[PDB]
């Protein structure tokens, strides 16, 4: 018999990378509310302290670690520390990332490479670090935060689009290579999500008009819109969903757009 | 605050077309277990009686109706009857369909047209019949049962593939046209699902070997694998998922295949 | 050794359905210029006479036939007539189609069905009618005119989107079922193409602004933009391209759009 | 009036990276036969000498340069040298690449990063180096050699799949960012192509059986199958094709497979 318990993360441990604020924090918060124990990392103590205080305020006892996602030795040590202090990571969400907006021909090789390293190579490093214990546990979930840029390009975001396109295919590869070992690796592809940074574009705006017209749902998304889909992909309720990119965009990728 | 209640269908009414047995019955059963009131139709009383007895045995008081999905007048009358006797349909699953396996050049125009009428035109008819009350209710869900044939072709299944390809795009269109009115229209694309009919292909088999090799998960799917994804798409937990085809295939569509 | 002769259609016969004017006429004209003998059909003598006069003015001796693409008996007889009078059809372009713009819930079941019959069932009928002689000839090409609506939905075009989505999958199915017999079946998916009908939307316009912003190439497409891709798919130069939808859209489907 | 001259590369210069042998050499050879002047690079003099001798034997006066594609300074200098000695690069084919086959959890971070650097970062570097002169010339083409791994994953090829997935999206981004400047950036996605290396898998074989069954065309592809599609994408005949991945796979990506 089906049970709604299939969506529950009770007794599972989730690592959400870079989950000190923003989308990662919202996903980790939903995970805790679904029953999970939350672990997270970020690049410095200041960010970790910020995440810890915010989890506490939401009634969550998270476990926070200082670690650079591009540092394999660092991540390996972090996983080992998490396993001794908290337990086996059942669920990994590759959320950490950066974006840069530079015309392609103006972007330095170093800058391009840095975006690739953080947004693509690092999810490989963290996945590699968690998979062996997931196999031994008999079940694992890896959720890669992709983008609409996993599908569509735009001026100024060449490196970001390249890395997210790579992350989409990395997702499908891990699914193929480890699905047999009961690892489900999927993507979440958020639409246009209203963050603190895009707030002036909503001032009582042509950019706001642009987004609303592109979106059948006729609104910006919010971090809260990602919570249900994220919990779904982390849960037993999605055990036969594998190598799939779940777009959460209010219908953008399905829509030609609202024409005048 | 996120809550697992977002996955609950409590107090909602779901119509699952052709849900007397098989995949539709399994989805409707999960819906009931998630809190929904179940209504379903099929082409004759014998099938309806079969579904009713099976729902009863599972502790579900379903409401069953005799109706041909290709009969617009019939479906319109059925919805009106459902609304007077049960209530407003919150969730429609377009599950009813047929398959034929005929080499294309050997298939009659009439046979091709019949597969198109049932598998494509009928989901349009039923969607059209439920959408006006969903808009007035302030929320609706339409879940279209697609296929891997919404993506990939195969000898002998030209009509079926054409209709399911159409259903994929119908899904994206409804999402675009009605998303503004808070209708989420999505697809479920099952992988290779083990039905009563494919049982001899699992006899202690080259076809069995074929499927397992194509599937990262290394097994046939089962109707039970569709239950969580179906409940997800019918629930508040997927409100910003729209015009999306959710493939539930253990990783098939993501995999090049297991080579020797 | 590769030769540019691989793009030549010299000594081949092409049937382009509904090619009396518009996109089909432009494709057929390019085919003739590439060396092909052109045959075409349309629903009445007036349209056939129009196409014939226009081919003549362009220095092309086309062969025109009155036939409804939804009439299997009619199409069968037409192919037989073409084979006796002109020769074996080497290349079929399924170009004939209609579009309707009606809100979905307002569209009659009859109207929806008519769009499906012409835009989806008819390409099946014509393909079926030409394939047996292509197999016997040792090579065939079928080019299905799809749309951006084979990928993306829009208010008012539910039936059209459904049929073109179906046509995309029909294309992939024929490729799979007949590729072994050296039939290559592909799609052409035009972007926004400037037709006589959209001319007021280019008056010295917000709709014009909409299109240009969606298109990396920063212009409407023209029928002429389809000529090279169409000749490519009809030629020996694309013999290992099969079940593929070739989008000719200046970059629309690849682009998130020009934001303000 | 359409002309077959639209497929001609007469008076154009093409740079094909790593085109000393294999797929790149075959594409460059077709380009020369289509009228182009051929320039190419490779990592050492031995490979350059090999390519030069092979071009000469085919009646082609190619221009060969020693350069590492991951060396931005090196590539920049190479382009400058090409422009002084040969002329402006009209067409870039990003063909250079490597593949590694290592289980993901066994692959070193350094090895993963090297595959990404060569197969993804390097196409960015070379594209960046050629685009400014293409803009000034008033027309440019960039053709990225992708893979079926731009779409589908497989055990042992995680890094390769990630890089090719990235290259697919880089292609779409360049299309979006530079399409306005009359740059068409597209992909070629070869299917299973019979190379010297896979020859024992064709010995009079289960792997051979695997490929043939996956392929509607019922054969391995050959480098020659890529020549027409490559010339197409480099030519005026594809000017409104942009951000598109042209799969040349005999129908593989369209096919569910030949079941027993």
Tab-separated table of N, CA and C in Angstrom, chain B residues 139-226:
chain	number	residue	atom	x	y	z
B	139	UNK	N	-7.813	26.468	-8.498
B	139	UNK	CA	-6.677	25.513	-8.560
B	139	UNK	C	-7.127	24.258	-9.316
B	140	UNK	N	-6.283	23.774	-10.217
B	140	UNK	CA	-6.545	22.512	-10.865
B	140	UNK	C	-5.225	21.837	-11.204
B	141	UNK	N	-5.296	20.516	-11.344
B	141	UNK	CA	-4.162	19.708	-11.780
B	141	UNK	C	-4.654	18.818	-12.923
B	142	UNK	N	-3.887	18.747	-14.014
B	142	UNK	CA	-4.121	17.748	-15.048
B	142	UNK	C	-2.828	16.959	-15.272
B	143	UNK	N	-2.902	15.641	-15.084
B	143	UNK	CA	-1.751	14.768	-15.274
B	143	UNK	C	-1.994	13.860	-16.462
B	144	UNK	N	-1.178	14.023	-17.502
B	144	UNK	CA	-1.309	13.207	-18.701
B	144	UNK	C	-0.342	12.036	-18.688
B	145	UNK	N	-0.862	10.816	-18.801
B	145	UNK	CA	0.007	9.643	-18.863
B	145	UNK	C	0.596	9.545	-20.265
B	146	UNK	N	1.876	9.855	-20.349
B	146	UNK	CA	2.594	9.831	-21.607
B	146	UNK	C	3.251	8.456	-21.745
B	147	UNK	N	4.484	8.426	-22.244
B	147	UNK	CA	5.180	7.165	-22.480
B	147	UNK	C	6.634	7.461	-22.802
B	148	UNK	N	7.469	6.424	-22.853
B	148	UNK	CA	8.774	6.646	-23.469
B	148	UNK	C	8.633	6.927	-24.962
B	149	UNK	N	7.505	6.488	-25.532
B	149	UNK	CA	7.133	6.789	-26.925
B	149	UNK	C	6.705	8.254	-27.154
B	150	UNK	N	6.650	9.048	-26.077
B	150	UNK	CA	6.566	10.513	-26.209
B	150	UNK	C	7.929	11.082	-26.620
B	151	UNK	N	8.965	10.237	-26.562
B	151	UNK	CA	10.351	10.638	-26.841
B	151	UNK	C	11.047	9.814	-27.928
B	152	UNK	N	10.789	8.508	-27.934
B	152	UNK	CA	11.509	7.550	-28.786
B	152	UNK	C	10.536	6.703	-29.607
B	153	UNK	N	10.882	6.444	-30.872
B	153	UNK	CA	10.066	5.601	-31.747
B	153	UNK	C	10.443	4.119	-31.720
B	154	UNK	N	9.609	3.287	-32.351
B	154	UNK	CA	9.824	1.835	-32.419
B	154	UNK	C	8.959	1.248	-33.536
B	155	UNK	N	9.488	0.229	-34.214
B	155	UNK	CA	8.714	-0.481	-35.224
B	155	UNK	C	7.392	-0.939	-34.601
B	156	UNK	N	6.350	-0.896	-35.421
B	156	UNK	CA	4.999	-1.353	-35.096
B	156	UNK	C	4.156	-0.381	-34.265
B	157	UNK	N	4.765	0.614	-33.607
B	157	UNK	CA	3.970	1.544	-32.761
B	157	UNK	C	3.835	3.000	-33.247
B	158	UNK	N	3.828	3.190	-34.563
B	158	UNK	CA	3.752	4.528	-35.148
B	158	UNK	C	2.587	5.387	-34.615
B	159	UNK	N	1.368	4.845	-34.631
B	159	UNK	CA	0.182	5.579	-34.168
B	159	UNK	C	0.274	5.944	-32.697
B	160	UNK	N	0.712	4.981	-31.890
B	160	UNK	CA	0.828	5.180	-30.454
B	160	UNK	C	1.856	6.282	-30.175
B	161	UNK	N	3.029	6.195	-30.815
B	161	UNK	CA	4.102	7.178	-30.642
B	161	UNK	C	3.650	8.574	-31.067
B	162	UNK	N	2.958	8.635	-32.201
B	162	UNK	CA	2.418	9.899	-32.677
B	162	UNK	C	1.449	10.515	-31.666
B	163	UNK	N	0.489	9.721	-31.186
B	163	UNK	CA	-0.464	10.214	-30.196
B	163	UNK	C	0.198	10.653	-28.885
B	164	UNK	N	1.188	9.897	-28.396
B	164	UNK	CA	1.847	10.243	-27.120
B	164	UNK	C	2.774	11.453	-27.247
B	165	UNK	N	3.350	11.609	-28.439
B	165	UNK	CA	4.151	12.791	-28.774
B	165	UNK	C	3.226	14.008	-28.762
B	166	UNK	N	2.051	13.851	-29.374
B	166	UNK	CA	1.014	14.895	-29.341
B	166	UNK	C	0.564	15.228	-27.922
B	167	UNK	N	0.407	14.196	-27.097
B	167	UNK	CA	-0.034	14.375	-25.716
B	167	UNK	C	1.002	15.125	-24.896
B	168	UNK	N	2.280	14.848	-25.156
B	168	UNK	CA	3.353	15.618	-24.534
B	168	UNK	C	3.196	17.110	-24.833
B	169	UNK	N	2.983	17.454	-26.106
B	169	UNK	CA	2.834	18.865	-26.493
B	169	UNK	C	1.506	19.463	-26.066
B	170	UNK	N	0.438	18.663	-26.073
B	170	UNK	CA	-0.835	19.118	-25.494
B	170	UNK	C	-0.635	19.524	-24.028
B	171	UNK	N	0.150	18.729	-23.302
B	171	UNK	CA	0.456	18.978	-21.891
B	171	UNK	C	1.115	20.364	-21.732
B	172	UNK	N	2.105	20.630	-22.585
B	172	UNK	CA	2.858	21.878	-22.552
B	172	UNK	C	1.987	23.051	-22.969
B	173	UNK	N	1.100	22.817	-23.934
B	173	UNK	CA	0.139	23.852	-24.321
B	173	UNK	C	-0.866	24.258	-23.246
B	174	UNK	N	-1.466	23.269	-22.588
B	174	UNK	CA	-2.429	23.518	-21.503
B	174	UNK	C	-1.744	24.275	-20.361
B	175	UNK	N	-0.515	23.864	-20.054
B	175	UNK	CA	0.319	24.551	-19.074
B	175	UNK	C	0.469	26.045	-19.404
B	176	UNK	N	0.784	26.330	-20.670
B	176	UNK	CA	0.997	27.678	-21.168
B	176	UNK	C	-0.324	28.476	-21.180
B	177	UNK	N	-1.400	27.841	-21.631
B	177	UNK	CA	-2.668	28.544	-21.840
B	177	UNK	C	-3.449	28.766	-20.542
B	178	UNK	N	-3.292	27.848	-19.587
B	178	UNK	CA	-4.069	27.885	-18.335
B	178	UNK	C	-3.252	28.010	-17.055
B	179	UNK	N	-1.923	28.059	-17.175
B	179	UNK	CA	-1.068	28.198	-15.981
B	179	UNK	C	-1.396	29.456	-15.195
B	180	UNK	N	-1.747	30.513	-15.921
B	180	UNK	CA	-2.104	31.796	-15.321
B	180	UNK	C	-3.299	31.640	-14.374
B	181	UNK	N	-4.228	30.766	-14.755
B	181	UNK	CA	-5.419	30.474	-13.964
B	181	UNK	C	-5.158	29.434	-12.864
B	182	UNK	N	-3.886	29.230	-12.515
B	182	UNK	CA	-3.473	28.256	-11.496
B	182	UNK	C	-3.888	26.818	-11.833
B	183	UNK	N	-3.712	26.451	-13.101
B	183	UNK	CA	-3.810	25.055	-13.505
B	183	UNK	C	-2.378	24.576	-13.749
B	184	UNK	N	-1.990	23.486	-13.107
B	184	UNK	CA	-0.706	22.854	-13.437
B	184	UNK	C	-0.984	21.587	-14.247
B	185	UNK	N	-0.512	21.577	-15.484
B	185	UNK	CA	-0.648	20.430	-16.347
B	185	UNK	C	0.732	19.849	-16.648
B	186	UNK	N	0.913	18.608	-16.205
B	186	UNK	CA	2.172	17.914	-16.321
B	186	UNK	C	1.959	16.521	-16.896
B	187	UNK	N	3.068	15.872	-17.235
B	187	UNK	CA	3.060	14.491	-17.708
B	187	UNK	C	3.774	13.537	-16.761
B	188	UNK	N	3.340	12.282	-16.788
B	188	UNK	CA	4.108	11.174	-16.230
B	188	UNK	C	4.480	10.277	-17.390
B	189	UNK	N	5.785	10.062	-17.564
B	189	UNK	CA	6.287	9.197	-18.620
B	189	UNK	C	6.892	7.921	-18.054
B	190	UNK	N	6.068	6.858	-17.911
B	190	UNK	CA	6.572	5.623	-17.306
B	190	UNK	C	7.634	4.988	-18.185
B	191	UNK	N	8.591	4.299	-17.556
B	191	UNK	CA	9.583	3.504	-18.281
B	191	UNK	C	9.011	2.158	-18.694
B	192	UNK	N	9.805	1.101	-18.543
B	192	UNK	CA	9.298	-0.241	-18.811
B	192	UNK	C	8.631	-0.775	-17.552
B	193	UNK	N	7.308	-0.813	-17.552
B	193	UNK	CA	6.570	-1.241	-16.372
B	193	UNK	C	6.021	-2.642	-16.535
B	194	UNK	N	6.319	-3.479	-15.548
B	194	UNK	CA	5.954	-4.879	-15.579
B	194	UNK	C	4.454	-5.039	-15.345
B	195	UNK	N	3.752	-5.391	-16.412
B	195	UNK	CA	2.315	-5.629	-16.360
B	195	UNK	C	2.060	-7.131	-16.538
B	196	UNK	N	0.898	-7.629	-16.058
B	196	UNK	CA	0.419	-8.983	-16.366
B	196	UNK	C	0.763	-9.497	-17.784
B	197	UNK	N	0.703	-8.611	-18.782
B	197	UNK	CA	0.905	-8.960	-20.198
B	197	UNK	C	2.351	-9.303	-20.595
B	198	UNK	N	3.318	-8.774	-19.849
B	198	UNK	CA	4.733	-8.974	-20.176
B	198	UNK	C	5.383	-10.065	-19.320
B	199	UNK	N	4.559	-10.750	-18.528
B	199	UNK	CA	5.027	-11.776	-17.593
B	199	UNK	C	5.807	-12.945	-18.230
B	200	UNK	N	5.346	-13.472	-19.392
B	200	UNK	CA	6.128	-14.531	-20.058
B	200	UNK	C	7.521	-14.074	-20.521
B	201	UNK	N	7.685	-12.768	-20.742
B	201	UNK	CA	8.989	-12.184	-21.093
B	201	UNK	C	9.946	-12.127	-19.890
B	202	UNK	N	9.462	-12.560	-18.725
B	202	UNK	CA	10.279	-12.633	-17.515
B	202	UNK	C	10.531	-14.070	-17.030
B	203	UNK	N	10.090	-15.053	-17.823
B	203	UNK	CA	10.298	-16.487	-17.550
B	203	UNK	C	11.769	-16.846	-17.356
B	204	UNK	N	12.054	-17.568	-16.273
B	204	UNK	CA	13.419	-17.975	-15.940
B	204	UNK	C	14.012	-18.942	-16.973
B	205	UNK	N	15.389	-14.772	-19.967
B	205	UNK	CA	14.707	-14.403	-21.208
B	205	UNK	C	15.431	-13.230	-21.889
B	206	UNK	N	15.618	-13.305	-23.230
B	206	UNK	CA	16.340	-12.255	-23.969
B	206	UNK	C	15.685	-10.870	-23.890
B	207	UNK	N	14.354	-10.824	-23.874
B	207	UNK	CA	13.633	-9.556	-23.718
B	207	UNK	C	13.824	-8.954	-22.319
B	208	UNK	N	13.773	-9.811	-21.300
B	208	UNK	CA	14.073	-9.447	-19.915
B	208	UNK	C	15.490	-8.876	-19.813
B	209	UNK	N	16.448	-9.573	-20.434
B	209	UNK	CA	17.849	-9.136	-20.527
B	209	UNK	C	17.988	-7.766	-21.189
B	210	UNK	N	17.249	-7.571	-22.282
B	210	UNK	CA	17.155	-6.295	-23.009
B	210	UNK	C	16.747	-5.115	-22.103
B	211	UNK	N	15.671	-5.303	-21.334
B	211	UNK	CA	15.116	-4.253	-20.470
B	211	UNK	C	16.077	-3.894	-19.341
B	212	UNK	N	16.549	-4.919	-18.637
B	212	UNK	CA	17.459	-4.755	-17.511
B	212	UNK	C	18.736	-3.991	-17.924
B	213	UNK	N	19.271	-4.326	-19.099
B	213	UNK	CA	20.455	-3.666	-19.677
B	213	UNK	C	20.224	-2.204	-20.060
B	214	UNK	N	19.005	-1.887	-20.486
B	214	UNK	CA	18.643	-0.516	-20.829
B	214	UNK	C	18.435	0.369	-19.596
B	215	UNK	N	18.152	-0.269	-18.455
B	215	UNK	CA	17.721	0.417	-17.238
B	215	UNK	C	18.848	0.469	-16.209
B	216	UNK	N	19.390	1.679	-15.931
B	216	UNK	CA	20.351	1.838	-14.838
B	216	UNK	C	19.878	1.166	-13.543
B	217	UNK	N	18.617	1.368	-13.149
B	217	UNK	CA	18.067	0.716	-11.943
B	217	UNK	C	18.120	-0.822	-11.985
B	218	UNK	N	18.313	-1.374	-13.185
B	218	UNK	CA	18.547	-2.825	-13.394
B	218	UNK	C	17.352	-3.696	-13.011
B	219	UNK	N	16.152	-3.164	-13.233
B	219	UNK	CA	14.924	-3.922	-13.021
B	219	UNK	C	13.808	-3.328	-13.877
B	220	UNK	N	12.753	-4.103	-14.102
B	220	UNK	CA	11.533	-3.535	-14.638
B	220	UNK	C	10.991	-2.567	-13.597
B	221	UNK	N	10.295	-1.536	-14.051
B	221	UNK	CA	9.467	-0.759	-13.137
B	221	UNK	C	8.208	-1.539	-12.796
B	222	UNK	N	7.499	-1.053	-11.788
B	222	UNK	CA	6.208	-1.597	-11.362
B	222	UNK	C	5.275	-0.421	-11.235
B	223	UNK	N	3.969	-0.673	-11.334
B	223	UNK	CA	2.954	0.367	-11.132
B	223	UNK	C	3.178	1.176	-9.848
B	224	UNK	N	3.685	0.516	-8.812
B	224	UNK	CA	3.951	1.157	-7.529
B	224	UNK	C	4.972	2.298	-7.634
B	225	UNK	N	5.884	2.196	-8.617
B	225	UNK	CA	6.913	3.206	-8.859
B	225	UNK	C	6.300	4.518	-9.361
B	226	UNK	N	5.078	4.447	-9.892
B	226	UNK	CA	4.412	5.636	-10.418
B	226	UNK	C	3.608	6.394	-9.389
